[PDB]
From a paper:
Family VIII esterases present similarities to class C β‐lactamases, which show nucleophilic serines located at the S‐X‐X‐K motif instead of the G‐X‐S‐X‐G or G‐D‐S‐(L) motif shown by other carboxylesterase families. Indeed, the analysis of the substrate specificity revealed its capacity to hydrolyse nitrocefin as a model chromogenic cephalosporin substrate (40.4 ± 11.4 units·g−1), and a large battery of 66 structurally different esters (up to 1730 min−1), including bis(2‐hydroxyethyl)‐terephthalate (241.7 ± 8.5 units·g−1) and the mycotoxin T‐2 (1220 ± 52 units·g−1). It also showed acyltransferase activity through the synthesis of benzyl 3‐oxobutanoate (40.4 ± 11.4 units·g−1) from benzyl alcohol and vinyl acetoacetate.
Residue numbers in the entry:
A (entry chain C), D (entry chain A): 8 to 409
B (entry chain D), C (entry chain B): 9 to 409
The structure:
């Protein structure tokens, strides 16, 4: 009956019905913003529930969200813009650009600050940073003496924390493994942000603004929410037992509203669905939207390939929660996950489906076989809580009536 | 004489073959064969008798027990709910059936004193849809677990309901740790139970509303209505010397009573027109004459090999599905999938998908050739003859484009 | 000048090459070469002598012993019956030849006191069509089994018939358990026997009715008629110093007598136009000028690699077919199949299919390029020269689209 | 927006900017000539810096360059022209054509002239020569007692050296390994030139001229620079510590300006960017340019395939520097490298990218997926010094905007 770009709109209304019945009415999520587009046409756009439960404020199309690690693909594009200019090669050692990192060694044993280390088989490369194969980690991993050291030095964030500090402190810490020999989610992408600053001579907020946000028409994407846009800023909620949630970040008096001087290429950005849609749609088009190009078509193709050894999936190389069943049949390129094997993933989709998510359960994907994309925004830490991103794929794929 | 790149003179070899090899020598009672390509019916032939005792001929409208050709219908029903966000394939079954949380794996002993081991992981919905759950069937007659099924009549009996099947399965061991092997099973009856649980409808009402009414299938049901019983075929079973005996009289059949068991695994009676319309809808990507039963992409997903590491049934199956005729065939979400034509030793295309019934009913869809067959007879068991392979030889042989 | 994307000036390199490398130096008596692409004959050249002794030139209409280029014809004949539902490839041979039920595998001893072991499984029709049955050839001269073939004259002799071949094979051991290796064999003579058994026709009449008359092949037969004997080439055999000697005088040849043996493996005499029409029919998916010899799909099935796990001949073959020239080549139902071009070390396409004759006759069809060659000479054995590879180099080199 | 053949010309200007900033201004290279073409349109052609620093002569479009091992693909085509005529088969033993080579054995131990040897598994084939799998080597390898023997016999070049001498001396030397069991860069291609002469009955310079250069319109490609073209001949420079260079060959009084007796099918040719462009463009077209055909379309397809065993890459079979990380995901056919795996190469491009380079850092590639090619000329020995060929791929691939 009502069909746009080979999608049945009546079937897509199942998105709203599902989010109501499974998340909003039972009080598992505060509110959602969902956008679906196919062949450059927005076929679905729905705000549901509340951006701020305490103040009884609804989710609107223009609501601002902490996108967290959905920052990573933006940083990754920023650095590959410089690749396109001949500025570095992926197989170059990081220490060429960060000479204090030349003597990075691998964790053997001991607690910070008396950690013993072994020689790595080879130096860390830029490709290792872009693929989380460098041996770096994250404080929040809470798994090893290396991430214990990150937490004691506040490398994930803290008062006075800057990228210059992150790089200075990382120069003196051990890696989890010899670069390239495993996969571990990490501050690597914050380091990628540091390299964008080093190579461009710009601060990461200015690079992003000049080379990505202004050209794509993304006026509502920033590291610091301006005072006049704070009314639009969603609260962040965290999971509580019984599939409930509590306030985790009040938008009035948030760290995201202060210009605190850490620009996290890994998870710093606040955005909205229109801004992230324009970014995603540019990628879906081969790097161009409405006359503005943020990356070469071929460079993006390269970023979308599986960059793991021997075309393995995350579970074959990952040392954390990324080794679990939901990452079965999914690889990783230069800042995107890549679906390798649909049946193995146990989730409907296409080979080559690429995207990433945020800690607060934000998610996007681009299916290059179907010319289809989704941007999903909510604020519920952590993103491991619910499989809503998989239920949305079920509904969206189910609406294809080609 | 050519329709849709098929030679009709070559297809007449179907009737000639079934006459000479099965009907004239008294191996089968009667047959109904339909072939379609590119949405055109190119062959449709009733032969022999639906009821030998009453000397009643097979007609186009004859009703047949399709048995496990019910399974793809149940599988579509459940994946309709997948399309609505109602469950995920990698979710544990025990999320929806909480009494199943502590299912364990058979180690040793006879029912009711079977010793068990902890499974590596809980059973998933994908395990049920792929027969990798560890469930079995009474009729397997291979293990102490299927002995227990037979002693509890889980395959069918007086007062038997889906609620009973699920209650009794909660207290039985699995053949193996979920996902680690393949074994043909009551899993699909459980899938029917899940359609009821998720839809809040009884399976007969769900099927009727969401599949049979939309596709125009008025002659498909769990219970044959009294006014259609005249069209109902007898069922026959194999006898030594390639003969057969009466196994179910259509007058006084259990299929004519509304007993309480709706078997998503093998309950349905249908006819060639009804199953044709179902098959044609699948061949079209889930739509027929403006009615859609499933998304094009969801069906594509169901048609994929869902066995580990793209293995064939013989690499994972523990039973008769491990034998040479399943070489080069995988399994998705209620369909077999041809992986390797030469290895199968049977002409066809990669991606040929379908399934069969215990009484030797068979259908396939070749998505490369846009070709499908529905074959109906009533001869238990389906392992008796290789007629479905002879039919593929003839049908594939008739492609002249 | 270019026809069907081939440069004719580049194709003239064929004549120049055969002159310079074979004819002028006295390595071959004479050659007939035909090349076609997209159904157009782009090259047709007779060179040198059909009969050196009588100073008779090769003409377009010269008749040649094509030997094992008979095999694809027999293979098509048997798969015609497959298309009619007459057998399945995974059926035991002993279903049709019941005296073969107890065939065993050679362990040790000389004929007639050979000791044997139980095969893992009975021989199948697919084993016969793929030379994986365990049968062999007298001329192999490698084992006590082929010694027994030679002592019983199973490859040919006075009074020898297919009925005799089948009777004597019933009492001999196999080289290996059916399907577990590949060995060039009398299997295809047995395939001819099965065509007779299933059709109720003698093989010469089946071929004539179902292949030669429909394709317009009036110059293909087991016996050269008296009035065509003037067109019959002499056969030559290799002599040291890259020379040759008379091996078969066309006047007083066994090919001119109607003895009782119809060899589906190597009996036929043909000419380049007849074999061209056969090859072109295959290249077209089994049809030429309104006559169809096989279904498009059946042929596709025959052209697939039927060896285990898509292996090449060297991974399974026990003889000279295991050597470097068969690297990257598989085998289907009477055709070799190129699997890996670089590994073959010879220009061509994946899927290139064909076969050759012991007197160095050769044909191939490249389904990627829609290209085929028929090459006729009479020089036993076909292992002597790599002319078939030089011709592929030149023919592939002439593609300019 | 200035676009030709789906290439952004403004993005291609990044080539000049990059070569200036990274190589020319800092004194790492003397001068460069860069050409890029896509779909038979030349989209970039820029001379930069100096062909002769001492004489302060600029690089011009028509400057002549020592292309060195970019000779090899030309020799490889020359020999496969004869394959197309039925003159030999790839699986024929070399000793069929060079009977003194029948008893070549494999190095076990000892110094020249008392080297002990073992029986090879099989004789060397023509395919082994075309793929550098023969067991031959090069004097300059400086790795084994076999290459020590080459240096002591001057097989790479010397006064009075001829192909007849190379073949006579190789008949008496051991191989590095049993033919076909490994890969080692070698004089094999000089031997291929010898076989072109043997099979054609022409001297290699005359064969090339008649069967390649005249038909393609390449008037500025030769083994000897004619006196009237010597004014156009670049100086050759070699690397010096601190990313500097010294004069290695004065164009006035170069061996390349004398008609000495050695025609090196492996590295003898001088060319210019227009001539090599026309050769490369002919290959990109399936072996034809402006009505002249140098090779059959299908023969070239065959030459472009990976000819290494089991579709392995160079690092899985190579015994030298070709076993290192920059050859990861690249195979070898009949005189071309072939990209097998783009992600594994860590360098943007397409599967099937084919080409080769010269000792003085000349490079070309053809991308048959993108219908794109580059010819890069400079004179800096050795070619292992800088990763400029990879930086150029980054920039050129980044300019694809269709
Ligand atoms: Cl549509």
């Amino acid at each position: 009956s009502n069909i746009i770009a080979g999608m049945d709109l009546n079937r897509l209304d199942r998105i709203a019905e599902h989010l109501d019945r499974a998340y909003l009415h039972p009080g598992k999520l505060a509110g959602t913003m969902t956008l679906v587009a196919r062949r450059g046409e927005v076929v679905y756009c729905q705000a549901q529930g509340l951006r701020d439960v305490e103040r009884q404020l609804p989710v609107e199309r223009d609501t601002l969200f902490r996108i967290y690690s959905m920052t990573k693909p933006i940083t990754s594009i920023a650095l590959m813009q410089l690749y396109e200019q001949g500025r570095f090669l992926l197989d170059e050692p990081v220490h060429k650009y960060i000479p204090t990192w030349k003597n990075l060694r691998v964790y053997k044993t001991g607690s910070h600050p008396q950690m013993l280390t072994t020689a790595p088989q080879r130096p860390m490369t830029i490709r290792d940073l872009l693929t989380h194969q460098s041996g770096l980690t994250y404080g929040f991993m809470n798994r090893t003496n290396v991430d214990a050291a990150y937490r004691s030095l506040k490398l994930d964030g803290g008062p006075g924390h800057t990228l210059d500090r992150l790089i200075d402190e990382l120069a003196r810490l051990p890696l989890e493994f010899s670069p390239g020999t495993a996969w571990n989610y990490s501050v690597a992408t914050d380091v990628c942000g540091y390299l964008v600053q080093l190579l461009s001579g710009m601060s990461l907020d200015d690079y992003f603004s000049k080379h990505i946000f202004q050209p794509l028409g993304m006026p509502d994407t920033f590291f610091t929410v301006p005072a006049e846009k704070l009314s639009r800023f969603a609260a962040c909620y965290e999971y509580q037992p019984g599939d409930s949630f509590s306030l985790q970040d009040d938008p009035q008096g948030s760290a995201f509203a202060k210009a605190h001087g850490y620009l996290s290429g890994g998870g710093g950005l606040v955005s909205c669905v229109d801004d992230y849609y324009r970014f995603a749609q540019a990628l879906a088009n081969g790097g161009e939207l409405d006359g503005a190009r943020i990356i070469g078509r071929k460079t993006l193709e390269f970023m979308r390939m599986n960059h793991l050894p021997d075309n393995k999936g995350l579970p074959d190389v990952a040392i954390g929660s990324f080794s679990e069943t939901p990452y079965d049949g999914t690889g990783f390129g230069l800042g995107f996950s890549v679906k390798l094997d649909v049946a193995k993933s146990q989730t409907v989709g296409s080979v080559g489906e690429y995207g990433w998510g945020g800690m607060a359960s934000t998610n996007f994907f681009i299916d290059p076989e179907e010319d289809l994309l989704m941007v999903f925004m909510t604020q519920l830490i952590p993103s491991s809580t619910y499989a809503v991103r998989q239920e949305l794929r079920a509904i969206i794929n189910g609406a294809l009536v080609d």
